[PDB]
Amino acid sequence: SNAMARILKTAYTFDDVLLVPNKSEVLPNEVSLKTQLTKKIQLNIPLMSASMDTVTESKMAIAMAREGGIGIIHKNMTIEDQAREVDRVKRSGGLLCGASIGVTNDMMERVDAVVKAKVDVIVLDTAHGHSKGVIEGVKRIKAKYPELQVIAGNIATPEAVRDLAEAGADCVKVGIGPGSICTTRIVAGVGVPQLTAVMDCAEEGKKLGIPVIADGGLKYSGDIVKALAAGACAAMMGSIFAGCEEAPGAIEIYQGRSYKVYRGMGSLGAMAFVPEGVEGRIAYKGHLADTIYQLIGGIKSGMGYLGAPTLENLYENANFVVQTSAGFRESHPHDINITKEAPNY
Amino acid sequence: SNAMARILKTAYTFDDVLLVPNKSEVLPNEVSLKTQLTKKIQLNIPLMSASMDTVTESKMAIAMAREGGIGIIHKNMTIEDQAREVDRVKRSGGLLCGASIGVTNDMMERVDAVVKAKVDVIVLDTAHGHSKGVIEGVKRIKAKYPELQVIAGNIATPEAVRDLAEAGADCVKVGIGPGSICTTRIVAGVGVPQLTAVMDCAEEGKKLGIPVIADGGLKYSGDIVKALAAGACAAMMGSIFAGCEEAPGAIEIYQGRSYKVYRGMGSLGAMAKKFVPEGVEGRIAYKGHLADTIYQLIGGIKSGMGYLGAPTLENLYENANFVVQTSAGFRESHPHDINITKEAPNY
Amino acid sequence: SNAMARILKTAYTFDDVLLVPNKSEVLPNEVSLKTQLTKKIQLNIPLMSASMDTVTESKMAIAMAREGGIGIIHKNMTIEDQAREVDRVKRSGGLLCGASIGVTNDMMERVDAVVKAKVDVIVLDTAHGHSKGVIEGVKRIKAKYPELQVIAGNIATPEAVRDLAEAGADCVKVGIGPGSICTTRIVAGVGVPQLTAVMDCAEEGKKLGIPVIADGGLKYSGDIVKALAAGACAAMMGSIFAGCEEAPGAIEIYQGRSYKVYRGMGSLGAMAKFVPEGVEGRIAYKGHLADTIYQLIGGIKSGMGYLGAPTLENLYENANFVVQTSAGFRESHPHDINITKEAPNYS
Amino acid sequence: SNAMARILKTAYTFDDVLLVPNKSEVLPNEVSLKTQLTKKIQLNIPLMSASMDTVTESKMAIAMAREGGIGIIHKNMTIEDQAREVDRVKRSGGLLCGASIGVTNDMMERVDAVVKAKVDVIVLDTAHGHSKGVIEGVKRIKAKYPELQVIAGNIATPEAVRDLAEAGADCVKVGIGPGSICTTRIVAGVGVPQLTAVMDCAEEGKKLGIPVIADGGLKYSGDIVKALAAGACAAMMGSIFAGCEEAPGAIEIYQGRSYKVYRGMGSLGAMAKFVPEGVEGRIAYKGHLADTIYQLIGGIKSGMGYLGAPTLENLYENANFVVQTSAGFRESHPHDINITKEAPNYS
Ligand SMILES: CC(C)(NC(=O)Nc1ccc(Cl)cc1)c1cccc(C(=N)NO)c1
Ligand SMILES: CC(C)(NC(=O)Nc1ccc(Cl)cc1)c1cccc(C(=N)NO)c1
Ligand SMILES: CC(C)(NC(=O)Nc1ccc(Cl)cc1)c1cccc(C(=N)NO)c1
Ligand SMILES: CC(C)(NC(=O)Nc1ccc(Cl)cc1)c1cccc(C(=N)NO)c1
Ligand SMILES: O=c1[nH]cnc2c1ncn2[C@@H]1O[C@H](COP(=O)(O)O)[C@@H](O)[C@H]1O
Ligand SMILES: O=c1[nH]cnc2c1ncn2[C@@H]1O[C@H](COP(=O)(O)O)[C@@H](O)[C@H]1O
Ligand SMILES: O=c1[nH]cnc2c1ncn2[C@@H]1O[C@H](COP(=O)(O)O)[C@@H](O)[C@H]1O
Ligand SMILES: O=c1[nH]cnc2c1ncn2[C@@H]1O[C@H](COP(=O)(O)O)[C@@H](O)[C@H]1O
Ligand SMILES: [K+]
Ligand SMILES: [K+]
Ligand SMILES: [Mg+2]
Incomplete structure (x- = not known):
């Protein structure tokens, strides 16, 4: 019968597209970066640190919150260690704080x-958010804690946004595969290029009043611009934050160069089922505050180019063009022996 | 006249596409990997070791069958030598076994x-399966041995699926050019990117009740998933198995590392054990015992079937939807912007 | 509502396209390269040196004018210093000179x-040309100096051409993100591949009788040909001229080879003299401007010969592009050859 | 007006495409490679060596003729020297011989x-063949020698095929910018990807009974199959033949590896014997012509087996191309193999 594999379309990631400049009466230092992570939860800047054992513990979640973002404490620890980490963030001046929950036996205990510990939002994330276990997990949590803010992921289709919204999620996290340390697309063959994923999911989210999070695959401040312009209410990152002194793990020095160890939570190291992540070393980047300053500066630039004083205006006025490989070469610095370090490239 | 060359379509291979997640009720450890290699042969996993002199002999084929797959013992040996290797496998507990056959004048004697020697399926293996020799060779074999199971190949179009099924083949092998050791596309200009060829051939084979094998170019566990979701009944690999201890060939040490020889059957070297070569010779990293390699493959497949909500291989096919990615989406899919230090055992 | 992000089309850069040859009655040595930079300023060759502190000061602007083109003195210096740079050009004969102007508190003073100091044309130069500040800046400058020739940039859309034209610009400069040293597309995610931007803008400009400049991203002479065939009246280059002796800066030697420093005006170092939108680095030292210009002019004249165009307007009216793939791109540059002699116009 | 630049289409080169296997009744040892270079000149194999001073003088033309092809003696030498080169070939047993002619003041004297010297075919060879000079030159030549076989080029559009045919060309040479040593697309921005160029032009040639030659950009035997399947009567190669002992220039050796010099006729080096339109470098020494021809022919015969073509006309009338991505390209070459043994037809 007609039941058979189909090739549906071409899907794009951030490097495939550029935003067209609009006429603008706004300069970068005049724009506002406030966003609604959920209906109840507002962030001053639309950035979140990933809930990985190499990215976010209390130290990182504290620095994120004081920069106007939010950190999700990772769940690769005891229930009581994680509550202690959430309690440390909240006792640091009432800062926002998130916590990651997995679909497990002790899920309700966690x-x-x-x-x-007065966590402000829990993220119920799985390898596969469009599942019975997640849907039934969100219903279970919201039945007990109707006011607790719940983010559910990860997913990559508007049907999964609709289904997770019917389950009671207050926000939905988008991203199957784009992780810099992720091999899910290589080992299972499954995933959706993240720009198409975010755009289609945000469009459906908007129909329902449910925001979506662009999780994974972001490397530069410009990628973040594209993701918010595609419709994400916030962007979540591991790689971009994992080289920072505030992320867990010590700054190791090898051959006179400083490194932090960054790894996927599906890697063999994090899990000490077939691995879906790798484990490696990135360059130490310094303090979170200097990274956030370049990211925020890049976003304010992009909104100035697009004439958007708010993130809503950016979404409603974003037009993409698709570029080829040859346009990719043109869009990055080329035919130049770059010497001096650039703080955002 | 209108008799002139044409550009028909764009054709895709595995790295061109990704499978879309589905609403899923089933977890990876719940699924069934069982498959029908032919109407009469079931495999416990849909994996097959290629019929090459650097991949499958009796040690490789015994290990494959013990893991639920099957090995096709190669023909680069005398007839009695190939019959004895088959019977070495069949005397190891009745394990399923295969042997490749060529379009030759000693064909029937082979x-x-x-x-x-109680082989279970022969593989009529030619560079060009959609040809008069293969069609007529399948008929002779089926007329002398109507029960014997015949895989025919290699081919790449639905018309070839139809002509080989009319000729009596119980299964057709798909793949012209994709092999890691294959230069057919470079020296003859001829091939079909493997995902489009599998999808097109599987669609015809399902109208006829004839399975198709995806042979060649599989590099990663996820590629197998795409090949099965595209409609193949099984995947056949050389490169993935050729480093394993149970493949023929001595372990080779170069500058303190371990490697095994891996070479195309159309390479100058394989052909000595006249036509221009259509493969290469080289060394491949030693991958330990076969068992370690199949485990990762199996786990990767099961992972893919949870993602698509598929408890059968059939269900995976009826619900598989592919999305095309660019070279930049390819760069996103693989790990990027990290100096991998520890060894990832399925990457 | 319908208010949301859209993907409009695919946009192309110079390396995506090739010009198709036309039937031709003219050989390269017969074509004319004269161009109208504004309806008041004629250039003998359609080439400009960018307004950067590593490209154009008095010395480069003098050499460019003498070759038939023009230089734009940069503005990373005091007002009296830039006026003094302009006067030295104007005092070296009847020589054309340009000067760049920012949207600054001291804009009218500059x-x-x-x-x-008798500047011939000013370039109102900003990262985002389609902006209130540039539009009102053009209107003020033209209200006070109605005869002064004003170029306004940088922009990338027909709507920007039209709004700058109605604000009084005599010419608009096209280029958002294609510069060799630019990171606007990486830092802000904003840009338009330069070939599509030049074609779209030049078509709009031609309806108004206002010309457009192709600024940035030009690496080879053939790139300039495609920029002019797409409708630009002139081509602006930083990288191509920044290795020349006439550019500011000393020659540097590293590991036996000659270089010059080159850096974007939005780089950390340029602004030392808001997050950066350019990088700083070194490019090969190319020698004197005269030999580089000879190569560029020769390549342009050869392009017009292939296209049967004795004038630049004829080039535009007869230009046809095909899109090439990645594989075509490798066909177009020398391939499968270990190049051993330096050619004056390649690598 | 509507007179403006246009983007006509996407155009393909050989690596963009693969040929689909056809049902075949013919094996590679059963096909025939005879071809008509013009109405009067038959070739036993469809191969020509390029008219370059690193590829073809009398030594190369003698060896090509003996192999069944033809060599085009270059014109970067005096009129008398080139006649004697042609004479040396004709007195080696009446072997087939071509000679290159330019659009020069002395062209009729050449x-x-x-x-x-009894040359069999003239090649009116010029950077841009779709030009008054070449049209008028072919007219002058055919008026004085009505029976002299005349090839003219180089061109890249069906319009050019028509215009040269009306002028009396017996065969047309297709290729603008695809040569291994060509920089025309880089310095002038001008060219057409070679597969599209040959397909369009051959189709136009067939309406006229005028054949087309695929000149340039061929790297493997498989690329020749695509060029003939696209409708070229013959393939012309520089790079593939410049490594042989029969090409002019000595066999050098550096660090144990032997090599020859190879350069464009538009390179600085060749012209000292307008800005350059080629590069100069070195390629691997390949040995004698006969060993290279054998591989090329085996590859072509293999391709025709895959496509079921007993003849080149059959190949053309049954050729169906599929377009492949960048990822299809990597699947098509060998991948994930440390090649230890050099193959006669792949490196
Ligand atoms: C455990 C492991 C290695 N794999 C899976 O759990 N696979 C998986 C789960 C459910 C289904 Cl239905 C299909 C596949 C893992 C661990 C941590 C994170 C991930 C990950 N892919 N995050 O995005 C994966
Ligand atoms: C012998 C050789 C080098 N080539 C051919 O037999 N070519 C070939 C055969 C028939 C036709 Cl009609 C066209 C081409 C070979 C040997 C072993 C395996 C292969 C191979 N490509 N298998 O997939 C090829
Ligand atoms: C200062 C800096 C770094 N950035 C901006 O001014 N950004 C910017 C300005 C306005 C708007 Cl609305 C949006 C972004 C700069 C300096 C010199 C040149 C450039 C550059 N990209 N020219 O093309 C940029
Ligand atoms: C001399 C030189 C460098 N260039 C031209 O003569 N260019 C050229 C001629 C006429 C026209 Cl209308 C347009 C361009 C050359 C010499 C030898 C071969 C070639 C070459 N590209 N052959 O294919 C070119
Ligand atoms: O092991 C893994 N496998 C797959 N995805 C992962 C894994 N670990 C983390 N991720 C995802 O990848 C994101 C980080 O991606 P990055 O910002 O590109 O480095 C995290 O927020 C997770 O959503
Ligand atoms: O020499 C050859 N030329 C072309 N194809 C070959 C040759 N040898 C083996 N093959 C095919 O390529 C496959 C090996 O695939 P691999 O897993 O990509 O290494 C085998 O199953 C054969 O179908
Ligand atoms: O810092 C920068 N950021 C972005 N664009 C720049 C910057 N500096 C110069 N540009 C642009 O890049 C052009 C030079 O480009 P190039 O010829 O490709 O090197 C200049 O004329 C400017 O239009
Ligand atoms: O200097 C040059 N510029 C451009 N094309 C050239 C030049 N010299 C030779 N050619 C062409 O390139 C072809 C050789 O192509 P190849 O086989 O790819 O090396 C010759 O047949 C000529 O048509
Ligand atoms: K750039
Ligand atoms: K070339
Ligand atoms: Mg510190």
Whole structure:
């Protein structure tokens, strides 16, 4: 019968597209970066640190919150260690704080402890958010804690946005495969290029009043611009934050150069089922505050180019063009022996 | 006249596409990997070791069958030598076994011997399966041994699926050019990118009740998933298995590292054990025992079937939707902007 | 509502396209390269040196004018210093000179000084040309100096051409993100591949009788040919001229080879003299401007010969592009040859 | 007006495409490679060596003729020397011989000399063949020698095929910018990807009974199959033949590896014997012509087996191309193999 594999379309990631400049009466230092992570939760800047054991513990979540973003404490620890980490962030001046929850046996026990520590939002994320286990997990949590803010992921299709919204999620996280340390697309063959994924999911989210998060695959400040212009309410990153002194792990020096170890939570190292992540070393980047300053400067630039004083205006006025490989070469610095370090390239 | 060359379409290979997640009720450890290699032969996993002199002999084929797959013992040996390798596998517990056959004038005598040795399926293996020799060779074999199971190949179009099924083949092997050791596309200009060829051939084979094998160019566990979602009943690999301890060939040490020889059957070297070569010779990293390699493959497939909500291989096919990515989406899919230090065992 | 992000089309850069040869009655030595930079300023060759502190000061602007083109004195210096740079050009004969102007608190003060120093054209130069500040800046400058020739940039859309034209610009400069040293596309995600931007803008400009400049991203002479065939009246280059002796800066030697420093005006170092939108580095030292210009002019004249165009307007009216793939791109540059002699116009 | 630049289409080169296998009744040892270079000149194999001073003088033309092809003696030498080169080939047993002619003030004198030496075919060779000079030159030549076989080029559009045919060309040479040593597309921005060029032009040639030659950009035997399947009567190669002992220039050796010099006729080096339109470098020494021809022919015969073509006309009338991505390209070459043994037809 007609039941058979189909090739549906071409899907794009951030490097495939550029934003067209609009006429503008706004300069970069006049724009506002506030966003609604959920209906109840507002962020001053639309950035989140990933809930990985190499990216976000309390030290990182504290620095994120004071920069106007938010950090999701990772769940690769005891329930009580994670509640202690959430309690350390909240005791640092009432800062926003998130906590990652997995679909497990102790899932409700973990939620209780991070709820007792007064976590502001829990992220129920799985390899595959469009599942029975996640859907039934969100219903279970919201039945107990109707006011607790719940982000569910990861997903990559508007049907999954709709299904996760019917389950009670207050926000939905987008990204199957784009992770810099992710091999899910290589080992299972599954994933959606992240620009198409975010655009289609945000469009459906907008129909329902449910925001979407662009999770994974972001390398430069410009990628973040594209993701918010595609419709994400916020951008979540591991690689971009994992080289920072505030992320867990010590700054190791090898051959006179400083490194931090960054790894996927599906890697063999994090899990000490077939691995879906790798483990490696990135260059130490310094303090989170200097990275955030370049990221925020890049976003304010992009909105100035597009004439958008708010993130809503950026979405409603974003037009992409697709570029080829040859346009990719043109869009990056070329035919130049770059010497001096650039703080955002 | 209108008789002139044409550009028909764009054709895709595995790295061109990704599978879209589906709403899923089933977890990876719940799924069934069982498949029908032919109407009469079931495999416990849909994996097959290629019929090459650097991949499959009796040690490789025994290990494959023990893991739920099957090995096709190669023909680069005398007839009695190939019959004895088959019977070495069949005397190891009745394990399933295969043997490749060529379009030759000693063809029936080679078939005679492997069948007496209780082979389970022969593979009529030609550079060009959609040809008069293969079609007529399948008929002769089926007329002398109507029960014997015949895979025919290699081919790349639906018309070839149809002509080989009319000729009596129980299964057709798809793949012209994709092999890691293959220069057919470079020296003859001829091939079909493997994902489009599998999709097109599987669609015809399902109208006829004839399975198709995806042979060649598989590099990663996820590629197998795409080849199965595209409609193949099984995947056949050389490169993925050729480093394993149970492949023929001595371990070779170069500058303190371990490698095994891996070479195309159309390479100058394989042909000595006259036509221009259509393969290369080289060394491949030693991959340990076969078991370690199949484990990762199997886990990667199961992972893919959870992502698509598929408890059968059939269900995976009826619900598989592919999305095309660019070279930049390819760069996003693989790990990027990290200096990998520890070894990832399925990457 | 319908208010959301859209993907409009695919846009192309110079390396995506090739010009198709036309039937031709003219050989390269017969074509004319004269161009109208504005309806008041004629250039003998359609080439400009960018307004960067590593490309154009008095010395480069003098050499460019003498070759038939023009230089734009940069503005990373005091007002009196830039006016003094302009006057030295104007005092070296009847020589054309340009000067760049920012949207600054002292904009009119800087315009007054270069006008008093007899500048021929000013370039109102910003990262984002389609902007209130540039539009009102053009209107003020043209209200005070109605005869002064004003170029306004940088922009990348027909709507920007039209709004700059109605604000009074005599010419608009096209290029958002294609510069060799630019990171605008990486840092802001914003840009338009330069071939599509030049074609779209030049078509709009031609309806108004306002010309456009192709600024940035030009690496080879053939790139300039495609920029002019797409409708630009002139081509602006930083990288191509920044290795020349006439550019500012000393020659540097590293590991036995000659270089010059080259850096974007939005780089950290340029602004030392807001997050950066350019990088800083070194390019090969190319020798004197005269030999580089000879190569560029020769390549342009050869392009017009292939296209049967004795004038630049004829080039535009007869230009036809095909899109090439990645594989075509490798066909177009020398391939499968270990190049051993330096050619004056390649690598 | 509507007179403006246009983007006509996407155009393909050989690596963009693969040929689809056809049902075949013919094996590679059963096909025939005979071809008509013009109405009067038959070739036993469809191969020509390029008219360059690193590829073809009398030594190369003698060896090509003996192999069944033809060599085009270059014109970067005096009129008398080129006649004697042609004469040396004709007195080696009446072997087939061509000679190159340019659009020069002495072109009829050059034609006179090589005709007296009994050349079989003239190549009016010029950077841009779709030009008054070449149209008028072919008219002058055919008026004085109505029976002299005349090839003219180089061109890249069906319009050019028509215009040269009306002028009396017996065969047309297709290729603008695809040569291994060509920089025309880089310095002038002008060219057409070679597969599209040959397909369009051959189709136009077939309406006229005028054949086309695929000149340039061929790297493997498989590329020749695509060029003939696209409708070229013959393939012309520089790079593939410049490494042989029979090409002019000595066999050098550096660090144990032997090599020859190879350069464009538009390179600085060749012209000292307008800005350059080629590069100069070195390629691997390949040995004697006979060993290279054998591989090329085996590859072509293999391709025709795959496509079921007993003849080149059959190949053309049954050729169906599929377009492949960048990722299809990597699947098509060998991949993930450390090649240890050099193959006669792949490196
Ligand atoms: C455990 C492991 C290695 N794999 C899976 O759990 N696979 C998987 C799960 C459910 C289904 Cl239905 C299909 C596949 C993992 C661990 C941590 C994170 C991920 C990950 N891919 N995040 O995005 C994966
Ligand atoms: C012998 C050789 C080098 N080539 C051919 O037999 N060519 C070939 C055969 C028939 C036709 Cl009609 C066209 C071409 C070979 C040997 C072993 C395997 C292969 C191979 N490509 N298998 O997939 C090829
Ligand atoms: C200062 C800096 C770094 N950036 C901006 O001014 N950004 C910017 C300005 C306005 C708007 Cl609305 C959006 C972004 C700069 C300096 C010199 C040249 C450039 C450059 N990209 N020219 O083309 C940029
Ligand atoms: C001399 C030189 C460098 N260039 C030209 O003569 N250019 C050229 C001639 C006429 C026209 Cl209308 C347009 C361009 C050359 C010499 C030898 C071969 C070639 C070459 N590209 N052959 O294919 C070119
Ligand atoms: O092991 C893994 N496999 C797949 N995805 C992962 C894994 N670990 C983290 N991720 C995802 O990748 C994101 C980080 O991606 P990055 O910003 O590109 O480095 C995280 O927020 C997770 O969503
Ligand atoms: O010499 C050859 N030329 C072309 N194809 C070959 C040759 N040898 C083996 N093959 C095919 O390529 C496959 C090996 O695939 P691999 O897994 O990509 O290494 C085998 O299953 C054969 O179908
Ligand atoms: O810092 C920068 N950021 C972005 N664009 C720049 C910057 N500096 C110069 N440009 C542009 O790049 C052009 C030079 O480009 P190039 O010829 O490709 O090197 C200049 O004329 C400017 O239009
Ligand atoms: O200097 C040059 N510029 C451009 N094309 C050239 C030049 N010299 C030779 N050619 C062409 O390139 C062809 C050789 O192509 P190849 O086989 O790819 O090396 C010759 O047949 C000529 O048509
Ligand atoms: K750039
Ligand atoms: K070339
Ligand atoms: Mg510190």
